Design a protein around this ligand. Structure first.
Ligand code: MNR
Ligand SMILES: CCCCCCCC(=O)O[C@H](COC(=O)CCCC)COP(=O)([O-])OC[C@@H](O)CO
Lengths: 342, 217, 341, 216
């Protein structure tokens, strides 16, 4: 670390360029990470809040279950006992002064809502507070939900389904808004599944239940694939750059070798230099990353914690150290005779 | 009457491209503490190969080379603890200061670099209060002077000098050979000094003439 | 250019790593480019196909227009002469065999549909060919559209609105399916507007009509910013590598300089070497890119043309040349005395 | 009957670190076609500085240098068309083959590389058939021999040799001087040869000795 660190102090220019490349790549990765997790809750936060153990679907033509195509007939509901019907739809909401589209979820009357959301299923509609402020609707005001006028029963917290806020209603009202005789679209099970499903039925765990959401897999997968390429690009940039860089130091390394410096000394020197460079870049990039994300999270969905910024950061730093050892491998294979001549 | 270095019947054969080349042929040299042993001979006679042999930089293809007090060590541990190299080119690391050229040797030996010693030695070589200078601010003679000082930091027993007056006019090259002799005697060093300037033999206690890799003994 | 090309021959290892980095970055950019154009067409292809000149919206509380909140009253339609009402809603379609959610666009009966879509607005609902096969429905079969029974007038091709295929219905049916007294959600103007708009009305261009779609701007914007960083990263990677790399050649360049090589000659050599390396990387990236994209276009919306693969490819390569000259600038200052050392 | 090179009252002053140093001091040298002129002296007396002046690698701080036939040409253009360099290190470009090390001078001069000419010159240096060898297949003498040949590729009128026998033993170094003089005579070259092995003066037509940048 003695030679390595002072190369950095006296020639900060060249190292600033490469550290910026590492920082930019991390900056992109940090915001892509937060954006992918933010969208995942933008797609799943409501169902996660209800926290069912298993979930029974309905299919047609033995296809993969889809939230857009499931209905449970009331006898089907009686078959599975110890089960709760969940109705899920998206439709237009219209107030006296404004309108918009939002998701409407329906559950049986009187069922307590998850502590994530709290309150109880009441006759009528429970609105997210932020939607009520936009619509200028108060408790007791009439709104048009999917062509049906219903009174706002109260405000709740905000959860999301398919980039829309969730309006919570009783099972009866949801049928009026969704124009269906079915008692729901899925069944939430809080217990162990002890009933066997019919050929046309399909039980899934909470994770697999997200596959039935249209946008979730095909967009989270693309973001994860993009994220994977970014990690590989980081590793390769470091490996590409660090190999040529250590080849630049051959002369100075030879002199220390000629003087008697052990192989561990030169290799520890070299990785110390690389680790410091990589640390600076990742810290600076991830700092700006968390800053830019927190500044933007109000306009664009962005989930920002400690693990969602530092997890990827630490992963990159470990990738860089593995990459550096691949590049600095030739620091111990340098003969000291290079110093005797030119 | 007890040598620091014993080169006995040492021969070196490098692969000169497709063929091989006997660069050194059965050289026999011995150096005792307090001697400045000059090695004279034209460029290409085998001085530097004998030097490299002496500096445990490469093992001979035949014959043996012994440094007493350091027996039973690999090549690199011997250089780090008992040899000082006054390279032909000063070989100063660019990003370090004058004093740091010495301190970095102390760091690679595993001891907290001692700044006091680094300044004392810089003064002895006549560079007092220049430890802050960077290479860009050091002239030819000064860089070579730092080199000698760096070779002394480790209190070596074998001091090797590879034509250390190669880029210095007559005035400056006297001072450097004077400094080498004076440092040799004052620290009871065993110094081998390769040199092409035959005017400097006066400063040497002995000298070996060389031709085509054979020591004329 | 003589030494530069044979440096590449004799040290293909070093260059493979850097060209791979450029190849990956170009591959990602090409695939990201295809994905952003694909998602944009997933959101806009229907409106763009209809190709209106201006589009009149309706707002509430003077807020920005939104396709999710705009309605055109019957009086509004008579006000704007030379204009037709377009109703846009998304709702569930249900057949005896299957079901799904789809977009429903409603226009006045008899309006000719764009050749992209073909046919003309008929009484009832015209289903997308892929949608009719999914539902096991044939032309003439009853279907539940937004809670109302509608007759399938025929099959059509697929255009998209908000990641959904468009079901085309007559203005009367859309009113029944979307439960509204309005004649539409926006007003399409094909000619230049000759009327000045009302307090609640707002004229917009075709582009601004896309920004009135909820997901479109907020997601295409994030994707475009990602592309900008990627182009920048490519340039910096090349500059970083090439500055360090050209420094490696100072000695060989000095020998040529001492021999009499002009400054132009050395600069051409260095830039030539970079150009070949960058060309290799970009060609491989765009090749592999188009292949993976064509291979994935069935599962993920991906628009694959010549301009969407070679446009970014040429952009990256030209950025590399600008970057390279920045990195090679120091080849003309190398003192030839370095060879006598 | 006209000189090729004339160095009249030239001096060089480099910024040696913080101070200055007079490297060359009032050098006067004139070479005629077919002359082998040595420059003898100890290491650091100003030999290389005088050579670099003769090759237009740096303008003198005072005094003039005239290469006749290159009047009205910048320093770089002068080296390319009239001067061959025999550097102290062979300075062979790693990635090129023995023959390619002649051809690249043809290329930097803007002419279709001449393979046959390169093979004749390599053979003229006693490397006949070795045009295809790479640098790893060349001995110390062989690289120095390829170096001379490259200086001869553009057929210069000034040949500058900078101690080209410094890493070769007595036998190999004799051969290079014999070769250098033989080529100097055959092609009417004007050659400066810096050397520290006074055993090679016998092959020079005359020689200058230098001390502290002053010639004698
Ligand atoms: C706030 C608005 C949105 C933002 C920001 C956003 C950010 C991003 C993003 C950022 C880098 C990428 C890549 C991205 C990519 C996708 N996206 Mn996106 N997306 N996105 C939507 C709104 C938004 N997206 C909507 C709405 C759907 C479809 C919903 C449904 O059908 O259930 C969707 C779905 C999708 C799909 C599924 C397409 C399919 O299955 O045919 C892909 C792929
Ligand atoms: C650094 C400059 C890079 C220019 C790339 C041009 C590629 C191009 O225009 O392809 C077009 C897409 O452009 C963008 O997405 C805009 C990106 C702005 C940064 C191809 O579009 P289309 O013709 O498929 O419709």
């Amino acid at each position: 670390m003695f030679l390595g660190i002072r190369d950095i102090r006296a020639a900060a220019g060249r190292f600033a360029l490469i550290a910026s490349v590492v920082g930019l790549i991390t900056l992109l990765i940090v915001m892509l990470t937060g954006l992918t997790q933010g969208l995942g809750k933008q797609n799943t936060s409501a169902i996660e809040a209800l926290a069912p153990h298993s979930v029974v679907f309905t299919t047609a033509g033995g296809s993969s279950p889809e939230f857009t195509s499931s209905e449970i007939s009331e006898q089907q509901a009686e078959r599975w006992k110890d089960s709760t019907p969940l109705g899920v739809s998206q439709t237009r909401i219209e107030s006296d002064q404004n309108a918009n589209t939002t998701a409407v979820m329906g559950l049986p009357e009187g069922t307590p809502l998850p502590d994530s959301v709290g309150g109880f299923i009441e006759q009528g509609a429970l609105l997210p507070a932020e939607l009520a402020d936009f619509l200028h609707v108060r408790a007791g005001d009439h709104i048009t939900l999917g062509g049906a006028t219903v009174t706002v029963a109260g405000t709740v917290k905000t959860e999301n389904y398919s980039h829309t806020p969730v309006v919570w209603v009783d099972t009866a009202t949801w049928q009026l808004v969704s124009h269906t005789k079915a008692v729901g679209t899925v069944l939430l099970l809080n217990q162990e599944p002890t009933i066997q499903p019919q050929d046309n039925e399909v039980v899934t765990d909470l994770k697999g239940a997200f596959q039935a959401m249209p946008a979730y897999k095909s967009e989270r997968s693309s973001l994860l694939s993009m994220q994977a390429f970014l990690y590989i690009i980081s590793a390769l940039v470091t490996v590409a750059f660090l190999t040529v860089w250590t080849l630049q130091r051959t002369r100075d390394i030879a002199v220390l070798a000629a003087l008697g410096a052990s192989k561990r000394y030169l290799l520890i020197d070299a990785l110390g230099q690389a680790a410091i460079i990589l640390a600076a870049g990742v810290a600076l990039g991830a700092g700006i990353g968390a800053l830019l994300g927190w500044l933007i999270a109000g306009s664009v969905p962005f989930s920002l914690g400690w693990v969602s910024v530092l997890g990827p950061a630490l992963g990159i730093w470990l990738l860089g150290l593995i990459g550096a050892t691949i590049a600095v491998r030739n620091v111990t294979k340098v003969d000291p005779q290079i110093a005797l001549g030119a | 009457a007890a040598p620091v270095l014993s080169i006995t019947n040492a021969s070196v054969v490098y692969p000169d491209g497709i063929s091989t080349v006997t660069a050194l042929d059965s050289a026999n040299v011995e150096i005792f503490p307090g001697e400045l042993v000059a090695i004279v001979g034209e460029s290409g006679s085998g001085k530097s190969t004998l030097l490299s042999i002496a500096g445990f930089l490469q093992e001979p293809t035949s014959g043996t080379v012994t440094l007493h007090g350091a027996e039973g060590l690999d090549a690199t541990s011997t250089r780090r603890e008992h040899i000082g190299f006054v390279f032909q080119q000063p070989n100063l690391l660019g990003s370090l200061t004058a004093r740091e050229q010495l301190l970095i040797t102390d760091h690679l030996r595993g001891i907290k670099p001692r700044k006091d010693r680094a300044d004392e030695l810089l003064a002895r070589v006549g560079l007092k209060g220049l430890g802050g200078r960077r290479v860009a601010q050091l002239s030819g003679g000064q860089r070579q002077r730092v080199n000698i000082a760096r070779a002394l930091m480790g209190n070596p027993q074998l001091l090797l000098a590879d034509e250390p007056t190669s880029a210095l006019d007559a005035r400056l090259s006297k001072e450097i050979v004077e400094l080498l002799r004076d440092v040799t005697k004052e620290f009871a060093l065993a110094t081998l000094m390769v040199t092409h300037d035959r005017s400097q033999l006066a400063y040497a206690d002995r000298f070996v003439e060389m031709a085509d890799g054979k020591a004329l003994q």
